[PDB]
DNA sequence: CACAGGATGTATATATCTGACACGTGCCTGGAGACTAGGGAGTAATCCCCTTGGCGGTTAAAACGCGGGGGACAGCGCGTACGTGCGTTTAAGCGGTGCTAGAGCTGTCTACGACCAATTGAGCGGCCTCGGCACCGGGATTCTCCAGGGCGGCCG
DNA sequence: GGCCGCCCTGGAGAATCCCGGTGCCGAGGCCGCTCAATTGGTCGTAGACAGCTCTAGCACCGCTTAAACGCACGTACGCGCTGTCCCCCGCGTTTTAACCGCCAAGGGGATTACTCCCTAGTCTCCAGGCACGTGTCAGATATATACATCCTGTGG
């Protein structure tokens, strides 16, 4: 079972991460990631780099354990890892303060949410796990992701419900026969998205090379790179850009940005002839976006769409 | 010598001849006629004897047989069987 | 003791069936305690009339096969073609009679 | 001398129920129509023989006669004529 | 070489057991078949050849009208051939099941 | 004042309080339930009158209306009626 | 006049349907020249032992139905559920008692 | 006195045919059942009452008991349980 | 936008419904107005008792039944789910009616 | 795809048995004559109950209309299954014999059931009376159905 | 720029179930009382039982051959799928006639006497039909065709 705060005080790992700077029940629970699940209060549990980590949140601090294979005191690499995947770097203090400074509608927003951070994740993982986070909910993209880990994943433990496994391979999922048997698990028109976005990969890119190098690339060529894959929108693209490529000028656009837009932003498509999803309506909110809150509106768009779900 | 056992043959017999004069009935045919024969005066009599039960009466007479054909013999049939009925017993009471 | 000559009742009443001997039937068939004089002469006239409609019919159809005796298979053919004789006859099946020629029309070549 | 009949059913061949069907009018003849129509003479015979060894249990014979047949067939209302009367 | 259609052979057949008035199942398995289904009933039983006789017609002439029945049956599904399941739904429509 | 009609009421009465003491009937009920009880009278009583004119005999006795019951009943319906007639005439005949 | 004390044929045999109703109904009903003394033991047995099931069984439909007496629906179903009991009364209309519940699997919606 | 009755077929309405065919199980009616089951339904009573109406004679009775209809029914073999 | 259930489910309903009551289902008048235009052509100027008309009607609901279940089976068993006269033709014909 | 010819049943003609039916005969048992008696049923008079007929208010149900969606019906393809024909094998059919279990009739007589006079109590009918059931009101639960969900590629 | 691919929750709305008070009328119990069930004999015959006869059923055998059985080949057909279109279901609105209660009249169903004639019951007598022989001719069998019918290639 999940580790809780009772369970093993020895195998815990304390990282500065204060609640004004973090919300973990905010971040994981909003989209930003399918592989994470709730079963005791304010604990997430997610296999990433083929090992389970659990975190909870503390008054002003962090706390991760791992599974793998009997070994505490995880190592500082670790560490490391877990503060690039969650830009322990990068201060939000001021980002919202200048937020409230040159809009008052964020601040009344950020009010009571405090906290709504983003993630790195790896590009591969990042990919095939919005994929098929097309038209669906949360918790049906989650336990897509979950059962196709199951099927392509290595496995690690039981961990008392179901079994937890590392993220499937890249030369697994650019086989043959894939599409048929993950549409048997229940993926829908998804499942061959995900074939195209992966042999395509190795047999038309260039192999994990040419992914790899867009993380240091510019933001245009690397979202084109994105959206030539199959099945790779704008939406999908920024999203990896954002989460899995370090581009903060990425703004996630969707019925829900839509939405909030249309209604407290009284926003408007001035250059478009039309208010359905369309690459240019797209373009014109993403420069919108950019324009009145800067370079780093992608971090501002998530804590308005975790607002938006719990509301 | 053994026990006699009664039918309808020559009572069959002459209903043909004088039907057709000319024509005869095989043992399986005049078999069938007599069980033909002894079917409807079974259900004739079964009819008859509800009737009589059902109206408080003891006795079978031409008018619980007359009623009994109507509700058995369908059609002309039952048309047909009330004529001639009728005719032999008045003819009967005649003479 | 020389009395008047004994007439049948059937020669009373012109009929062929024995009137006696359904008298007798009756009285032995516990249909009723008493079984009046006319009700013999009349279930002897309905069995005589309905034996004639039969053999009429059969002896019709014995002479449109060509032969000159009764055989089961006339019988049948009789009950059968005749509405109200097949419907007196609806759940009783003749011996070695055989069934009436009958194919559907679906059945046939086209 | 005491015997046993068993399996008696298969007497009732393929090319039997065949000329029955053709009696009846039956052009064409699925495979599975033997079995079902040895089931159904089955139950039928089963159902008039307990009548007739019934009526003859009654009257004390160890013979069936034949018009206890007519009287089984006759509760049934399935009346047979030309086995007596 | 003179192989008649699938079905012409079938109409003779119809035609020359219509016009007939034999037995159509062979006397003697049918009288094996009487007796095992009466030894159930009653052992050392004794039959006569008439009661075997009639045995035989009624079983026939309820057969061929089952058939009837089954024809029936089968034609109402836009078919020509006969399959169990028109037999359960004669029998069923009758009363028998 | 009129003539009085019999009906099979109270005897099942007794036997439905025999049977389930807290429960009742209605007069529906009770009609449908004479009418059968009237009906299987009937029947039992047609088959052994059937059964003593086939056997030449002219008594109605319990080996008939066991016989009649047999040829009736289906299954064990009629085992357990002639284990209860059984039971009736051995107890009337010793007492 | 003192004779013995009454006692009903009825309560001899332990049963309750009458035993002298029925021998009377048998002698009355043109059945049988004569009838002997056991037969109404018999049929009364039959009688009441049939009487008995149905009205079981409709005491159980009752029940199950949360009532407390007897209806003809409860008779239906009683018949309708048992075998034995169906084909004793396979050509009866029992009024005002329905028709059991039976919806065909082809038709429920897939 | 004198009332003679005509076209009284078309009582048993389409609506009652329909709940007729759903007590018995039925989920879609073609339009041409109704007039069908009209007949049918002329058919059955023109025997019944017919039989009815015989006993009626043979009593010397003008009117038509509920037994004379139990014994028409028990004459088709449809045996009726409620009336006597 | 109007609340309208898909076809078929009323009619399930409506089956439940009534095989769960035991009431008649043929109005009284009409059906009294056609056993009397029956009868007329049989005897004229005839009585009826209410318990013989009321006998009749169960009769023929009873009937009707029957045949409406023999009729859906052989509808179903043509691979339909509606019953046509050709239906209660060989129902009819089947059970020995014509 | 219409048609003439080849091949296969099929009905028609004719001789030739043969055994099943139609006719003649003896007799005996079941039907007819004649007479009596007693009860079942026909007939008249009466009570009164159940049916028929009329009427008006209420409103539940039937009739009409419209939209559409689901089912009926026709067409098409295909692949297994069943018809058809031939060679083998099986056991049904026929007649012949032999034995005997059991159906079938007969004679005794005994116990069982019909019938009758005398009682008497069980059961039918009439009358309370109260509790089970029909029903209404309101709320909760359940079942059905359609719109919208961090969308995307496409033919208009 | 709608639009459907695939389908999966979440409400909205309608139907149904559950709980409790109301009230009402019919099921159940009681009570007198009349007729049918029970007692106690008595007598007549129905059938149970023993015995004998002789019929038909069962068993076996040989041996002829019709029929069943197995097998191979081909094609008619059942079955699944798709598309179209039409008609039956669901729902709302308007009409109508069923239903309920009331009243009154009288038709005839049911009960009771009274009588009479019609059928069961006996005895006697005789002839109609049943069992038994027997002859002969209608039908079954076999052979020999003349024609109807089915199936297929060649020809256009």
Same mark, same amino acid.
């Given at each position: 079972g999940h580790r809780t705060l009772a369970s093993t005080p020895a195998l815990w790992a304390s990282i500065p991460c204060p609640r004004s700077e973090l919300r973990l029940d905010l971040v994981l629970p909003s989209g930003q990631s399918f592989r994470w699940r709730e079963q005791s209060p304010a604990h997430w549990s997610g296999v990433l780099a083929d090992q389970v980590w659990t975190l909870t949140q503390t008054e002003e601090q962090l706390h991760c354990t791992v599974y793998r294979s009997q070994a505490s005191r995880p190592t500082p690499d670790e560490l490391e890892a877990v503060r690039k995947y969650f830009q /322990?770097?990068?201060? /939000?203090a001021q980002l919202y303060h200048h937020w409230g400074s040159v809009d008052s509608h964020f601040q009344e927003v950020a009010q009571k949410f405090q906290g709504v951070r983003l993630l790195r994740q790896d590009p591969i993982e990042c990919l095939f796990s919005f994929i098929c986070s097309s038209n669906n909910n949360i918790a049906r993209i989650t336990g897509m992701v979950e059962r196709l880990c199951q099927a392509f994943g290595p496995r690690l433990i039981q961990l008392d419900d179901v079994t937890y496994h590392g993220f499937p391979s890249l030369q697994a999922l650019a086989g043959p026969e894939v599409e048929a048997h993950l549409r048997k698990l229940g993926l829908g028109y998804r499942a061959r998205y995900v074939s195209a976005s992966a042999r395509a990969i190795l +047999?038309? $890119? #260039? #192999?994990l090379a040419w992914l790899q $190098? /867009?993380? +240091? &690339? &510019?933001y245009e060529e690397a979202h084109k790179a994105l959206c030539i894959l199959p099945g790779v929108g704008t939406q999908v693209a920024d999203c990896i850009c954002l989460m899995a490529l370090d581009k903060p000028q990425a703004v996630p656009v969707d019925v829900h940005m839509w939405h909030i837009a249309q209604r407290d932003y009284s926003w408007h498509p001035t250059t478009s002839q039309a208010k359905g999803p369309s690459p240019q309506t797209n373009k014109e909110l993403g420069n919108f976006f950019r324009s009145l809150?800067?370079?780093?509106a992608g971090w501002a768009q998530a804590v308005l769409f975790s607002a938006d779900l719990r509301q | 010598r053994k026990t006699r056992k009664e039918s309808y043959a020559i009572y069959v017999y002459k209903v043909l001849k004088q039907v057709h004069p000319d024509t005869g009935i095989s043992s399986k045919a005049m078999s069938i006629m007599n069980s033909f024969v002894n079917d409807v005066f079974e259900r004739i009599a079964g009819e008859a004897s509800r009737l009589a039960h059902y109206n408080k009466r003891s006795t079978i007479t031409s008018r619980e047989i007359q009623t009994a054909v109507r509700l058995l013999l369908p059609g002309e049939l039952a048309k047909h069987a009330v004529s001639e009925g009728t005719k032999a017993v008045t003819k009967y009471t005649s003479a | 003791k020389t009395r008047a000559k004994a007439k049948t009742r059937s020669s009373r009443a012109g009929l062929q069936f024995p009137v006696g001997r359904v008298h007798r039937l009756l009285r032995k068939?516990?249909?009723?305690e008493r079984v009046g004089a006319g009700a013999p002469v009349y279930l002897a006239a309905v069995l005589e009339y309905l034996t004639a409609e039969i053999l009429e019919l059969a002896g019709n159809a014995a002479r449109d096969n060509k032969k000159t005796r009764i055989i089961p298979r006339h019988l049948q053919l009789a009950v059968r073609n005749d509405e109200e004789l097949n419907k007196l006859l609806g759940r009783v099946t003749i011996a070695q009679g055989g069934v009436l020629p009958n194919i559907q029309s679906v059945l046939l070549p086209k | 001398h005491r015997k046993v009949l068993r399996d008696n059913i298969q007497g009732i061949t393929k090319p039997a129920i065949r000329r029955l069907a053709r009696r009846g009018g039956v052009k064409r003849i699925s495979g599975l129509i033997y079995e079902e129509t040895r089931g159904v003479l089955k139950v039928f015979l089963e159902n008039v023989i307990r009548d007739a060894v019934t009526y003859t249990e009654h009257a004390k014979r160890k013979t069936v006669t034949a018009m206890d047949v007519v009287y089984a067939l006759k509760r049934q209302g399935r009346t047979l004529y030309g086995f007596g009367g | 070489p003179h192989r008649y259609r699938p079905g012409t052979v079938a109409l003779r057949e119809i035609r020359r057991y219509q016009k007939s008035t034999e037995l159509l199942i062979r006397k003697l398995p049918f009288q094996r078949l009487v007796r095992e289904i009466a030894q159930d009933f009653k052992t050392d039983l004794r039959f006569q050849s008439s009661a075997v006789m009639a045995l035989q017609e009624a079983s026939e002439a309820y057969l061929v009208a089952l058939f009837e029945d089954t024809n029936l049956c089968a034609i109402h599904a836009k078919r020509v051939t006969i399959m169990p399941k028109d037999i359960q739904l004669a029998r069923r429509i009758r009363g028998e099941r």
């Amino acid at each position: 079972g999940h580790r809780t705060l009772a369970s093993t005080p020895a195998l815990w790992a304390s990282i500065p991460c204060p609640r004004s700077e973090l919300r973990l029940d905010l971040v994981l629970p909003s989209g930003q990631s399918f592989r994470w699940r709730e079963q005791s209060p304010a604990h997430w549990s997610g296999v990433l780099a083929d090992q389970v980590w659990t975190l909870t949140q503390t008054e002003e601090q962090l706390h991760c354990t791992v599974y793998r294979s009997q070994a505490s005191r995880p190592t500082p690499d670790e560490l490391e890892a877990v503060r690039k995947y969650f830009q /322990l770097d990068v201060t /939000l203090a001021q980002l919202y303060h200048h937020w409230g400074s040159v809009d008052s509608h964020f601040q009344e927003v950020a009010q009571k949410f405090q906290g709504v951070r983003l993630l790195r994740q790896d590009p591969i993982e990042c990919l095939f796990s919005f994929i098929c986070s097309s038209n669906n909910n949360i918790a049906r993209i989650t336990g897509m992701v979950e059962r196709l880990c199951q099927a392509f994943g290595p496995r690690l433990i039981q961990l008392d419900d179901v079994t937890y496994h590392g993220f499937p391979s890249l030369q697994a999922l650019a086989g043959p026969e894939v599409e048929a048997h993950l549409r048997k698990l229940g993926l829908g028109y998804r499942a061959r998205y995900v074939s195209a976005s992966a042999r395509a990969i190795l +047999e038309e $890119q #260039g #192999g994990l090379a040419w992914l790899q $190098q /867009l993380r +240091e &690339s &510019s933001y245009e060529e690397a979202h084109k790179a994105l959206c030539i894959l199959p099945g790779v929108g704008t939406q999908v693209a920024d999203c990896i850009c954002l989460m899995a490529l370090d581009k903060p000028q990425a703004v996630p656009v969707d019925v829900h940005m839509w939405h909030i837009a249309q209604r407290d932003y009284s926003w408007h498509p001035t250059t478009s002839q039309a208010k359905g999803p369309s690459p240019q309506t797209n373009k014109e909110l993403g420069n919108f976006f950019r324009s009145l809150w800067g370079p780093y509106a992608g971090w501002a768009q998530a804590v308005l769409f975790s607002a938006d779900l719990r509301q | 010598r053994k026990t006699r056992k009664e039918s309808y043959a020559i009572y069959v017999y002459k209903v043909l001849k004088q039907v057709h004069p000319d024509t005869g009935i095989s043992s399986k045919a005049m078999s069938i006629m007599n069980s033909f024969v002894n079917d409807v005066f079974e259900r004739i009599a079964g009819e008859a004897s509800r009737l009589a039960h059902y109206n408080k009466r003891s006795t079978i007479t031409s008018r619980e047989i007359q009623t009994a054909v109507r509700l058995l013999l369908p059609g002309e049939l039952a048309k047909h069987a009330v004529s001639e009925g009728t005719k032999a017993v008045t003819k009967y009471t005649s003479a | 003791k020389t009395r008047a000559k004994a007439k049948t009742r059937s020669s009373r009443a012109g009929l062929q069936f024995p009137v006696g001997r359904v008298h007798r039937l009756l009285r032995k068939g516990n249909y009723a305690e008493r079984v009046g004089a006319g009700a013999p002469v009349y279930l002897a006239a309905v069995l005589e009339y309905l034996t004639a409609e039969i053999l009429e019919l059969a002896g019709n159809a014995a002479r449109d096969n060509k032969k000159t005796r009764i055989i089961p298979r006339h019988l049948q053919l009789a009950v059968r073609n005749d509405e109200e004789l097949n419907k007196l006859l609806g759940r009783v099946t003749i011996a070695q009679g055989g069934v009436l020629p009958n194919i559907q029309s679906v059945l046939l070549p086209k | 001398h005491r015997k046993v009949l068993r399996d008696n059913i298969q007497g009732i061949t393929k090319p039997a129920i065949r000329r029955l069907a053709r009696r009846g009018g039956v052009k064409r003849i699925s495979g599975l129509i033997y079995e079902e129509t040895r089931g159904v003479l089955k139950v039928f015979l089963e159902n008039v023989i307990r009548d007739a060894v019934t009526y003859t249990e009654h009257a004390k014979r160890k013979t069936v006669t034949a018009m206890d047949v007519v009287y089984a067939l006759k509760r049934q209302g399935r009346t047979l004529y030309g086995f007596g009367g | 070489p003179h192989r008649y259609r699938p079905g012409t052979v079938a109409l003779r057949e119809i035609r020359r057991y219509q016009k007939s008035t034999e037995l159509l199942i062979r006397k003697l398995p049918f009288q094996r078949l009487v007796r095992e289904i009466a030894q159930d009933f009653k052992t050392d039983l004794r039959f006569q050849s008439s009661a075997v006789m009639a045995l035989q017609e009624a079983s026939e002439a309820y057969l061929v009208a089952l058939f009837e029945d089954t024809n029936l049956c089968a034609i109402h599904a836009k078919r020509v051939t006969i399959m169990p399941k028109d037999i359960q739904l004669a029998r069923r429509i009758r009363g028998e099941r």
